[PDB]
């Protein structure tokens, strides 16, 4: 029951995140412009996409026992859960660090604060 | 449909070669079997017997098979004397403690069973004097510490239901063991046949499968920590 | 889980050597018995020859692969023993494995494979159809035969390619999502 | 382990002396060598330059045989005729019970 | 490739039932014999009791797990037969499997496992050391025993998820290569 509930909110979330990103794309003003806000807009866009890009298979493997149609060895779900559950998190800070000029400005501020420290 | 049997209703039968009684609920004492010294087999189930006469092994010298299941047996008297006895089954009784000398000198014992009792304390040297015991059964009991001395000859063993048994056993004392059923699968990680199996859900020595996977999660953890802390620094 | 049975017909040469001719068979390891490998001479037994509780008339030597042919279930409206009871009795008698011909009583398959928390240390195999009739034809025609029960090990682990190619679509799709956004970015550039 | 060049506990004797017969005894599963000065009943001592071994008397109805086919004495109910066992004394020969063998 | 051997004893109850007591053993399936599972009663044989070409004295029944104890190699400077010859002869006699005690002639291990393009349909197992002395002690003590030989199936395929971590380093390192160049690009930007 808890797994079904978490999937239900996951699919509703994925749908509403996709709808919101589509709405952002439909906004011509922010799209064609080179505003700095769009940097973190796209950033959270890629983050929100990769969240289920890495978690949807975990859901597939969790429902695999529920389908009980394929003989799944314990090791396969063990490995996929241990590798793909922490995966969507550990890479988000890297993506923001190395794919956002706003983070570069924040890092310049941090360097200034360290030097004045 | 045997309801009640007279207390002294089987004595003096100096050649009664067997005796089986079942369903005698109204019986509340062990029968006064003195004189009947040629009972190869004996059975008494579904009766309200509380204890056993102590001279049992001194009277039925050539007793071979004995069974006292489904009774209210509480205290086990000394069994020294039934040197030809082979099987004992006392399951579904109120037996609560086991002393060292209860099984002293049961040379020919082969099958033993105490399942579904209240035994929790087994003396360390309980099985030291045992012979070629093959099946031992103490499933569904309150064991906490399991002695293993003088048990290497066992072939089959069960401990399922012993929740208080949170420990494991050394393979050095179970040389000839074949089948085992322990309450927790981790108790089977030390070793052939086992129940329940130690599946990939519950590994034995490495939580992360093989090497280079531990390295994978190591790298994941270090990069997540470092990048996250740098992000907090920059943001706040 | 399938059982591979070979029936060996040895003939004694006068010099002392043995000549063997074997025939193949395939059954299914029933849940009532552990899926192991056994070997022993075939001793066919009547279905009604197991309920009896006086074995002293038929003390057999150990290691005999018994064979039973179950019959019409209505033909025995008062069943002396359950099928599992028959298997237990056979194993008590020194059998090393038991084979049932369920060609006429198909419900015995689910009767054996149903929930029974008392599995037997020796394998139990049920056959049906062409293999069953072949076994009956050889049993009631030859004089001595030794049967061998073989448990084929499992097959190749196709799991290898499964997740790397799975990750291949995952990586490809994730990159596809990334480049689709980049294509939008290029559209803004134009 | 008597009269044995090399006796092992598990396999009994394995090389009899120079002038001795190496014989294999079957008991249960246990099979082991022995050294005897003369092979027992139902066997004929076959000499050799390496090791001298006993062999079964292949001639039927025999209890003691001098060679692979010459029986010194047959079992009961078979008179001896040129080392061969016959229930009856053939033509030119008559039974003789006192020594249980065929006479002229 | 390892062979697991169970030695089962009997005590025929007068009622007709059979009581068993088993002991464990571990050998190695030698290359000379196909790795399979066989079962049969133990019939110990002297090393010199095989080369003889007159079996009519001791015709045995089919399916007997022979046991041999090899001795000091110098004790037989004129070898009657090779070890493989002994195994072939034993199989001719109707043996269903052969077990060698090489505890005293260790070179027999490589003699059996060496290049022999004539493998035997029945398994050949050689034991040595504590298991060998245990087997010899039981054989020369009991009266009847039945040996069971089991071929353990292979273990888990860790090959499954080793590529996932292998490709994980590969993808991470390739990302490291790309990101270092991006770091150089950012240095040019500054």
Author numbering:
A (entry chain D): 706 to 822
B (entry chain D): 283 to 473, 520 to 564
C (entry chain E), E (entry chain C): 57 to 246
D (entry chain B): 40 to 143
Reproduce passages from the article:
Leucine-rich repeat-containing G protein-coupled receptor 4 (LGR4) plays a critical role in regulating the wingless-related integration site (Wnt) signaling pathway and is essential for organ development and carcinogenesis. Cell surface-expressed LGR4/5, members of the class A G-protein coupled receptors (GPCR) family, have an extracellular domain (ECD) comprising 17 leucine-rich repeats (LRRs), followed by a seven-transmembrane domain (TMD), and an intracellular domain (ICD). ZNRF3/RNF43, LGR4, and RSPO form a ternary complex on the cell surface, which relieves ZNRF3/RNF43-mediated suppression of Wnt/β-catenin signaling and thereby potentiates pathway activation.
Cryo-EM analysis of this sample revealed two distinct LGR4–RSPO2–ZNRF3 complexes with stoichiometric ratios of 1:1:2 and 2:2:2, corresponding to a heterotetramer and a heterohexamer, respectively. We obtained cryo-EM maps of LGR4-RSPO2-ZNRF31:1:2 heterotetramer and LGR4-RSPO2-ZNRF32:2:2 heterohexamer to resolutions of 3.2 Å and 3.5 Å, respectively. The two TM helices of ZNRF3 were loosely sandwiched between the two TMDs of LGR4, especially between TM1 and TM7 of one LGR4 promoter and TM6 of the other LGR4* promoter. The two TM helices of ZNRF3 made contact with each other at a distance of 5–7 Å on the extracellular side of the membrane. In addition to the ECD dimerization of ZNRF3, these intermolecular contacts in the membrane restrict the spatial positioning of the TM helices of ZNRF3 and bring the intracellular region of ZNRF3 into proximity, which may facilitate the auto-ubiquitination of ZNRF320,28,29. In the 2:2:2 heterohexamer configuration, ZNRF3 ECD and TMD are largely enclosed by LGR4 and RSPO2, resulting in steric hindrance that prevents ZNRF3 from binding to the FZDs, thereby suppressing its ubiquitination activity. Moreover, no apparent contact was observed between the two LGR4 protomers within the 2:2:2 heterohexamer.
